[PDB]
Amino acid sequence: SGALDVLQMKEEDVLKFLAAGTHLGGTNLDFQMEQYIYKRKSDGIYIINLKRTWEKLLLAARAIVAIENPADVSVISSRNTGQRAVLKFAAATGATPIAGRFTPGTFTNQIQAAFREPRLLVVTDPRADHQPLTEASYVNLPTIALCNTDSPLRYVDIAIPCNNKGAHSVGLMWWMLAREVLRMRGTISREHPWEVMPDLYFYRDPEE
Template identity: 35%
Template sequence: MSQQTEATDIKKKVLATGIRVGTQVKTKFMKPFITKASPEGLYMLDLDLTLEKIQTAAKFINRLGAENLIVCSGRQYAETPIEKFCESLGSKKLLGRFMPGTLTNPSLPYYIEPKLVLISDPQVDEQAIIEATNAGIPIIGIANTDNITSNLDVIIPANNRGRKALATVYWLLVRQVLIERGELKEDEAMKNEIDDFETKITEEEIE
């Protein structure tokens, strides 16, 4: 399979996951990443730009070392994607509430000094952004059409609320990091599929 067809296949595969479906709100920060609004009034993100930014983020992660990266999210749907991501690349995860002082107060038992922070939602993970900014740690952030991204160093424009969309972003990131490292060929399949990265919903949650 040529790189070209693989790239087309990847696009087809991820389009179905809702990765580019935004919200009914667009901020000035996210305007450059928006292509149009859907008939339902939802702003749509430019998938080419998303894939481009995932490449940028992967280069950044490899340059600073995945083991020096900490991935945070207070969003439940991001838990499985982040666990899979960290398992695949050897990064550290911080799920649930971000404890104040984690990146800024060396006297705390849970204090850490990563070289890079990855967050799933600038709104939910605001505390992580504030602390990383204060500590001078670069931030990669997955941002939706309604997010404020002024403190992010790399913005990955994507739907950061949907289960499948979040799974897709983290899956694409792992894939790209492995490609950049030379551990995976462009036209090679990953051992984990997008589904493996998805947070499964239990029946109680549906009711």
């Protein structure tokens, strides 16, 4: 980075990452996903580094800020875990959520009453939301997403590594993303702790 400590790692957030198990990562690698891994464990787990997570969070977020009108940075997730997360995301920062089954042809059509035309996309898990990704390259959208350690990289301009096999790893990462964009664009910045909880960005989950 280059800012003094106000765009660099904080002692607090390290604890939150490790409590939510984001550092742990799946038992497979790609030829593009080996530049964020450090090494393997005794176990089949492959340990994502959090330094490498932190830088990628920032320039990803700075691009989300750069649009003049935030009302067309369309977020998407279809897996259950990333549903509750995206809804709070797009409430907090001006965005348009697309929860559940995508319904393809959304941006390709001209005649469709659910037609959209955003600029950016922020997708959870490339290999569950493959339909909008393929469709991104017909309308010249930049793309950002959360990769595991083995998700295919293709139509992903920038990645933000994560564990993302569920748990608290999903909701935590979307919460952190929303923290950063408000520090930069808004006036929420104070470098002293944000009021909003990462708790209500987690999965609803079958209740008591």
